Every structure is written in C-alpha cells, then in structure tokens.
Curated annotation (Swiss-Prot), chain A:
Keywords from the named record: Ribonucleoprotein, Ribosomal protein, RNA-binding, rRNA-binding, tRNA-binding
Gene of this entry: rpsG
GO MF entries: mRNA binding; rRNA binding; structural constituent of ribosome; tRNA binding
Example of a GO cellular component annotation carried by this entry: ribosome
Misc. remarks from the entry: The strain K12 sequence is shown. Has been predicted to contact the N-terminal domain of IF-3 based on footprint studies; exactly how IF-3 interacts with the 30S subunit is controversial.
Superkingdom of origin: Bacteria
Biological processes per GO annotation: cytoplasmic translation; negative regulation of translation; ribosomal small subunit assembly; translation
Species of the source: Escherichia coli (strain K12)
Family affiliation: Belongs to the universal ribosomal protein uS7 family.
Lineage, opening ranks: Bacteria, Pseudomonadati, Pseudomonadota, Gammaproteobacteria, Enterobacterales
Ribonucleoprotein is among the record's keywords: yes
Residues of the full protein shown: 2 to 152 of 179
Function as written in the Swiss-Prot or TrEMBL entry: One of the primary rRNA binding proteins, it binds directly to 16S rRNA where it nucleates assembly of the head domain of the 30S subunit. Is located at the subunit interface close to the decoding center, where it has been shown to contact mRNA. Has been shown to contact tRNA in both the P and E sites; it probably blocks exit of the E site tRNA. Protein S7 is also a translational repressor protein; it regulates the expression of the str operon members to different degrees by binding to its mRNA.
Full protein name: Small ribosomal subunit protein uS7
From Swiss-Prot, chain B:
PROSITE patterns per the UniProt record, alphabetical: RIBOSOMAL_S21 (PS01181)
Keywords: Ribonucleoprotein, Ribosomal protein, RNA-binding, rRNA-binding
Annotated source species: Escherichia coli (strain K12)
Protein name: Small ribosomal subunit protein bS21
Family, as annotated: Belongs to the bacterial ribosomal protein bS21 family.
Gene (name only): rpsU
PANTHER family in the cross-refs: MITOCHONDRIAL 28S RIBOSOMAL PROTEIN S21 (PTHR21109), SMALL RIBOSOMAL SUBUNIT PROTEIN BS21 (PTHR21109:SF22)
Biased composition range(s): Basic and acidic residues: 57-65
The organism's taxonomic lineage, starting at the top: Bacteria, Pseudomonadati, Pseudomonadota, Gammaproteobacteria, Enterobacterales
Disordered: annotated segments: 40-65
From Swiss-Prot, chain C:
Gene that encodes the chain: rpsK
Full protein name: Small ribosomal subunit protein uS11
Misc: Has been predicted to contact the N-terminal domain of IF-3 based on footprint studies; exactly how IF-3 interacts with the 30S subunit is controversial.
Organism of origin: Escherichia coli (strain K12)
Any one biological process term the GO annotation gives: cytoplasmic translation
Self-association state and partner proteins as the record states: Part of the 30S ribosomal subunit. Interacts with proteins uS7 and bS18. Cross-links to IF-3. In stalled ribosomes contacts ribosome rescue factor SmrB.
Entry's transmembrane regions: none
Key word NADP present: no
Cellular component GO terms, alphabetical: cytoplasm; cytosol; cytosolic small ribosomal subunit
Keywords: Methylation, Ribonucleoprotein, Ribosomal protein, RNA-binding, rRNA-binding
Keyword RNA-binding found: yes
Function in brief: Located on the platform of the 30S subunit, it bridges several disparate RNA helices of the 16S rRNA. Forms part of the Shine-Dalgarno cleft in the 70S ribosome.
Family matches, as InterPro entries: Ribosomal_uS11, Ribosomal_uS11_bac-type, Ribosomal_uS11_CS, Ribosomal_uS11_sf
Swiss-Prot record, chain D:
Species in which this protein is naturally found: Escherichia coli (strain K12)
Gene3D superfamilies given in the database record: Ribosomal protein S18
Biological function: Binds as a heterodimer with protein bS6 to the central domain of the 16S rRNA, where it helps stabilize the platform of the 30S subunit.
Encoding gene per record: rpsR
Quaternary structure and partners: Part of the 30S ribosomal subunit. Forms a tight heterodimer with protein bS6.
Protein name: Small ribosomal subunit protein bS18
Length: 151, 65, 112, 65
RNA sequence: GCUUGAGUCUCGUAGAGGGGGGUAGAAUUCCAGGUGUAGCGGUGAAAUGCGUAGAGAUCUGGAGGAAUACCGGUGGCGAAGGCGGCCCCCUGGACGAAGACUGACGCUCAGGUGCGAAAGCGUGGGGAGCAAACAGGAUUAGAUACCCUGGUAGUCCACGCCGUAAACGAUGUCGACUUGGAGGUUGUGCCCUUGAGGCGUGGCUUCCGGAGCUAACGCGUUAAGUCGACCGCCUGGGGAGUACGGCCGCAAGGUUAAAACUCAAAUGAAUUGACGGGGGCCCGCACAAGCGGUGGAGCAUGUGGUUUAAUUCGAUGCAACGCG
C-alpha cells in the first residue's frame, strides 16, 4: 500500500511431492475458489505431461516455465510531463507468478476437450516454446527493445 | 567545449561543458531579453543568498538533535 | 566513392532539428539523413532519441566511401548535442575530438 | 585569498603573459574573483590587461578559431 | 575682528558619470558554391506557413545591422532619470592623510531656468531579428485575447518637440545629537610584513534589533526618535485630477484648476476562517497493477416527465432514486 511494508504470506506446500512453486500454480488456476478440482487438474496434467515427455513431474514443469519467463517488463513511470512506458527488471516472485498466470491465461482459451488436456497441451507447447504463453512473453519483449531508450 | 578523452575511454565524460557553457548561458537567451528582469533576479538571488548565509550563521540552536 | 580515408562528422543540434552530416577533410559532404525522415512524425521530433536514430541512419549508406575515424563538430543550442554522439560510438566509428565552429553575434540582437 | 597582486607592487601588466595566462581558463574566459582572491581594483586592472593582451593576440579570446 | 559653517589650493584614490571618435569575442538571417535526403514547425495536442523546383539543416566565402553572456556582487557612480569589453581625447562630481589661505561668502526657495525612463511626433538615414496594428491557423457556446506562424510603425544613429511613470527607500532639502551587532566597498594612520595578520580613524550602502515613535506593519545612528531653517500638498467618497478659461506643443496632449448633483460611507496596515488549475509533508481501493460489475439484452423496484377525475404525501448532486 502507501506505508505498509508487509511481505508475502507463507502458503501451504502441495500434498504431493514437496514443491511450493507448483502449489502457487495450483493457487493461480482457481475459478470460483475450487481448489480440489484445481489440484486434480494439475495432477492429471502433470501425469499426462510426464508420460508424453519422459521427464519427471518436477523437471518437465521446471523447463516449461523458463520458456514463458519474461526478462524485463514495461510499466508507466512518468516524471513531470509526458507519460511514457518504462522498461524494468521484474522481481522473481512476481516473475514466475506472472509466467504461471500467462500459462493459465493461455489455458483458458484454446479449448480442445477439457481443462487438464488444455493445461498439458499448453505445457507441451511451452516445452518447445511455440505456444501461446510464449507468444505473450514475446509480446512483452516486443514492448521492450524499442521503448528501451527511456531510462 | 573541447576535450579529447583518449582511446581507452568507451564513454563521453564531458563534465567541462556543463560547468561553464552547456546550460547556464544557453537556455536563457533563446527567449526573453526582459530588459530589466536580469537585475531583478540578481537582486532576488543575492537576497536569498544573504538570507541563507544569515540563517546559517544563526543555525546553531538546540533543535532537539 | 573515391575511397576516402577519413571524414569530419558535423552535427547540428537545435531546438528545431538535429542533423548529422559527414564531409571529408576538404569539406564536401558524403551522405546524411534526417531525424524527420527516420520516423517520428510530429511531437517526437524534438527528442534525443530522434537525434540517435538520425545518427544511426547517417551511419549507413556511406560504406562505399569507407570512413574509419572522424572529427565531431557540434553546432547550436537545444536538447541534443550530447546524446547523439554516443550513437556515433555504438555504430562503429572512432571519435577524434568534439569542437564547435560558431560564434555568437559579433554584435547581434535577440528577441523573446 | 592568495592573490599575487594584494602584496603585488609593480601592478599587473599586459606583457608578462606567463603570469597573465594563469587568470584565463582553457576556453579563454576570465577567471572570476570569487575563486582566486584578486581584489576588485587589481581585478579590474587584470581584466583590462587580459583584454588588452587579447587585442594584441598575446592571449586567445577563445579556442574557436 | 575670530574660527569650529561654507569655500579654494597642494598629494592621491575608486567608479557602468557624461559627450565624441574607433577596434574586438559565447549565433538565428540573406546570397553564392560542393554534398545528399524525406518531410520540416510548434504545442497539452493540433494546424497556418516552408518542401522532391529539392526544404529545416552540412562546411567555406561575402553582406549589413542596434547592441557587451563569463567577469557580476541589496557591488559602484550620478541631484534624479539612468549608466555596465577595450583604446584615444575632453570633462564633471565623490572620498582619504598632513597641511596652507578668505572669513559667514551660509540653508531653503514662490515665480523662473535646466536635466529628465519608456511610448509618441517632425526631417535626413539604416532596416538584420523581433514587434503593437493586420492576415492566417488552433481552444471555446462565442475569442476581433491568452497559443502558434508571418508581418508594418517602432525598438536605432544626427538635430529638435513632448515633460508623462507604481519618476517608489510611496519617507522633500540642510544641520546637530542619540545604545549596537553582522557585512560589502573604498582611502589612510599605527604595529613585528615578525606567517594568507592585529589595533583605529573617514565616506557610501545592505540586513537584524535597544530606548523612543507609529493605528499597526514596522523605522530605528543613511529614522518613520528629539529638535531648528525653508519649500510643496490635504481637509470624506463619487463626480474628477473632469469641464470652462490661461499658457506651452506640429499633433497626441501636458500644466493650473472648479461648480451643479448623489451617499453615509469610502479607505488604512495587521489577525483569524475560506480559497489558490499555489507549494512542502502525511493519510483513505484516492491514484498505479489486477479481479468482478453498470452502461449492450431481458425480468423486480423507485424517480423524473406524459395522460387521467385519482395516478396520496415527503425526500429530490455526492448526503434521494429495492428511500419513508
């Protein structure tokens, strides 16, 4: 807020093998608060991803996120006059959460059969970085590299 | 105005310009001679300077610090 | 194209425009480009990035002449005069010296 | 405070350009009296000697020629 | 007759003091020449205007023109207005040390005389950049204004006219006395220059404050304190610093200067609320990021308005509209 310097809260780890980042991926999937359905969809999508790729559940999801991981992002910081976008490096806690948000936002569209199949197909397309969330990343990168001279 | 800043430089470092010429005599003559107001702003600037000097001469107080 | 060895990059920075124009030692120009031909129609003309892209589009279309190093001759007031010369560094040129070749009036009157 | 003209008998002349060069900068401009002493009588005589040496091309007006 | 008033001479000091004659440095403009390209110009944004004839711009050469960024300082000079490279000539005024001379020649001034910011007027010239008036383009319900692009008088030299300014430290000129501090500037005496210092005496000037004064703010040893000499102005506001008359001026106009009529107010610095498209600091999902809605469709409810003989009454900008 304005003065409050409170930090992030400590969420519960996932009831599968211990990884808090995929628990945050469970947390940002969640329509209508339905956490149990979100955990079932994440679990089934990680099994159908580890089956089609041959990797584990913690390392196929590891290299699915660095292809949707943005480098810098733009935000409006005007200083006395004209309003221009400012490219800046994002903090990693915001970075990986926004990348998972991009994965889920790409998973909301492109409806093949069901939500677990959509999430597995989005992670499979982010494996060889030709899907939709990597296009969101390349669009955020196109917002930079030409408006980069303002610093 | 003139500097060489020899070959292992990779940067301008032209601090001699802004000390003398670059702004203080440049963005004052593009408009508004004013015909009097240089004398008025010189009066106001030296008044502010002598009041700041008289305040710094009397700045020694308690001040709770 | 004459295969000239060096040149002199005269830069005119103003509140109007920021040109970069490269002549030889004897003072006939070898190719140049404007900050207005480089895009930015209208309000973004008086930005230093317009001077940067003017120096960028001056850096090319002169490779037939083959200029290695250059002298920098700034001229005029304005928001430029300091940001475009770094565009003369990243584009593959060697700066010799930065000078100015203009006097003030030798008895002249300036309005508002 | 360390002026060479305050105890400086045989007042500052235009011919001796070795000591007269120390009161101009690199761009030929006159060094102010707010930096190097040079009380106002000897400062005005110094400015006269500077510009009468600039007239005789003993010291440059500037490096813009 | 005398000298402490005033004045003159001797030795010097500082100054943008004035007048005349010349020489020179941080860049928009015009012309010519080489170059080479797609737009230039401003604003919150936009256009007029300039441009493929090749613009704004690139270097060189030339042309003229009224003027001094740095030094530069509530720093200095001049009675005031005002005056700011430098060189040459003329010339005034101010101040300091030891003296020498006249002996009240001294202060103020109605009338009168001279100087007098800028704007303007007349003649002979210059005209580069701006710039009233004027044109075009933007904003607005309207804009003949604030904004922009051009542009004439003028801003400018020689000689006159006009004599007006918020010509204001709003404080008339001269003399005397009156605690003080911090300074700036300019001389001089003395001390060991024994080391960029120390102790005093004169002029001008800035700020703060003692007594005192003032309606207050504030002035405060250059007083608005206490006095003495003289000149000018006022008896409420509007009318009105207007009209008539006299004088000056080529004109614009200026000086002097009423009356009739209306009102019981006008005004004066200062304090407290309000406000500033005034700042500094702080706060609230107030703004930034994000989520879900309204306004696009249909149903429940209320209001405005219409009709009726009634469509009971109140609330009716946030602070009324699923309210009573």
């Amino acid at each position: 807020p304005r003065r409050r310097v409170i930090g992030q809260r400590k969420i519960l780890p996932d009831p599968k093998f211990g990884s808090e980042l995929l628990a945050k991926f469970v947390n940002i999937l969640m329509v209508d608060g339905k956490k149990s359905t979100a955990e079932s969809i994440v679990y089934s999508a990680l099994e159908t991803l580890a089956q089609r790729s041959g990797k584990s559940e913690l390392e196929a999801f590891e290299v699915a996120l660095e292809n949707v991981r943005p480098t810098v992002e733009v935000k409006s910081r005007r200083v006395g006059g004209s309003t221009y976008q400012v490219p800046v490096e994002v903090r990693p806690v915001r970075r990986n959460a926004l990348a998972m948000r991009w994965i889920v936002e790409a998973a909301r569209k492109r409806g093949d059969k069901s939500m677990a199949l959509r999430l597995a197909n989005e992670l499979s397309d982010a494996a060889e970085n030709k899907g939709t969330a990597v296009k969101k990343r390349e669009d955020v990168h196109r917002m930079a590299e030409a408006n980069k001279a303002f610093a | 105005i003139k500097v060489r800043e020899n070959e292992p430089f990779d940067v301008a470092l032209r601090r001699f310009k802004r000390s003398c010429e670059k702004a203080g005599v440049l963005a004052e003559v593009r408009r508004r001679e004013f015909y009097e107001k240089p004398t008025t702003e010189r009066k106001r600037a030296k008044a502010s300077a002598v009041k700041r000097h008289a305040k710094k001469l009397a700045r020694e107080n308690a001040r709770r610090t | 194209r004459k295969q000239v060895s060096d040149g002199v990059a005269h830069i005119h920075a103003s509140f109007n425009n920021t040109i970069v124009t490269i002549t030889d030692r004897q003072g006939n120009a070898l190719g140049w480009a404007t900050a207005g031909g480089s895009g930015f129609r209208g309000s973004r003309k008086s930005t230093p990035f317009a001077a940067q892209v003017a120096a960028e589009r001056c850096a090319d279309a002169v490779k037939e002449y083959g200029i290695k190093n250059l002298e920098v001759m700034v001229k005029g007031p304005g928001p430029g005069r300091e940001s475009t010369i770094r565009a003369l560094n990243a584009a593959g040129f060697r700066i010799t010296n930065i000078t100015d070749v203009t006097p003030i009036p030798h008895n002249g009157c300036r309005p508002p | 405070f360390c002026r060479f003209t305050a105890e400086g008998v045989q007042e500052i002349d235009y011919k001796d350009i070795a000591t007269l060069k120390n009161y101009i900068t690199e761009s030929g401009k006159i060094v102010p009296s707010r930096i190097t002493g040079t009380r106002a009588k000897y400062q005005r005589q110094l400015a006269r000697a500077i510009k009468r040496a600039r007239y005789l091309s003993l010291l440059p007006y500037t490096d813009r020629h």
